[PDB]
Amino acid sequence: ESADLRALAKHLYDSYIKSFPLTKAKARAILTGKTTDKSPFVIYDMNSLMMGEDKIKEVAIRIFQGCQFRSVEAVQEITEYAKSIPGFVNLDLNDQVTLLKYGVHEIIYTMLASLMNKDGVLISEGQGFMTREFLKSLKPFGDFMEPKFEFAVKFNALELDDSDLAIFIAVIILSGDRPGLLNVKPIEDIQDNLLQALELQLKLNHPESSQLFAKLLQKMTDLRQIVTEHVQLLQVIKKTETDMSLHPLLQEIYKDL
């Protein structure tokens, strides 16, 4: 019955709000000049990057490690979200590990789009904002943000809100095509449910948006290509800069094939 799927949707949106401090709703309010939320300081160049301290080593390296620390933070937020998905903590621990390993970046880049417009990305819980052009002007680092921006601009076109994203993020984790899974069937059973709940939510929440469900599912291939591209680019950056750390959490997630 649809009735159960609605309760599942409401549960998931609720733990999404509890798990992620910076929702798309707050991000969009910050980004469009709304009075619910303050203004960001904008980092468009190096001097603005320095002023960003009075009110919120090399530069491309600091920025990149910042993306790492934020990711390490998001992995925690995503992991707490995962535990709220009905059934997830009942799975074999190794499969729990495998689902997070492969799902976490796909989720990070989905939710990063929430913080993006054509021109840039919120940073530091929305206090600041750093232009897409500044990030494109950084030789090995100058291109690392561009595919995320490209996907975010297409993804934001779906006009999804947080209650839709909560379910879709859950669908991403509960994949079951992930490499190395022990018991695929109990994972697929959870996802069948999540897919029905997502399908119903999009239908109720976006009634004049034909086949939004299919188009959202199609954006999953883009996410996979962002991740696999970023892994290749991550290899390059680590060899050209032998002095750049990678957090051990991200290192473990980025298992060579």
Report the nearest approach of ligand GBV to the CB of residue 249 (Å): 9
What is the number of the residue whose Cβ is closest to ligand GBV?
66
Instruction: Decide if residue 62 touches ligand GBV (CB under 6 A).
Output: yes
State the residue for tokens 């469009």. Answer: 32
Cα R_g (the chain), whole angstroms: 19
Give 126 or 212: the residue with its C-beta nearer to ligand GBV.
126
- Any binding-site annotation on 105? yes
Distance (Å, whole) CA 172 – CA 103: 6
Give 12 or 120: the residue with its C-beta nearer to ligand GBV.
120
Q: How many residues does the chain have?
A: 257
- CB-CB contact of 191 with 171 (8 Å): yes
Q: Where are the beta strands (DSSP E) in the chain?
A: 41-43, 116-117, 120-123, 128-131
- Considering only residues 120 to 179 of the shown chain, the ones binding ligand GBV according to CB under 6 A are 121, 123-124, 130, 145, 148
CA 147 to chain centre: 13
Give 199 or 222: the residue with its C-beta nearer to ligand GBV.
222
Report the nearest approach of ligand GBV to the CB of residue 87 (Å): 26
Distance (Å, whole) CA 203 – CA 207: 5
- Considering only residues 101 to 120 of the shown chain, the ones binding ligand GBV according to CB under 6 A are 105, 108, 112
Residues 6+ apart with CB under 8 A from 55: 41
Distance (Å, whole) CA 165 – CA 214: 14
Report the nearest approach of ligand GBV to the CB of residue 68 (Å): 5
- Any binding-site annotation on 144? no
- Considering only residues 23 to 52 of the shown chain, the ones binding ligand GBV according to CB under 6 A are none
Give residues in contact with ligand GBV (CB under 6 A). Answer: 62-63, 66-68, 70-71, 105, 108, 112, 121, 123-124, 130, 145, 148, 234, 250
Known binding residues for rosiglitazone? 68-71, 105, 230, 254
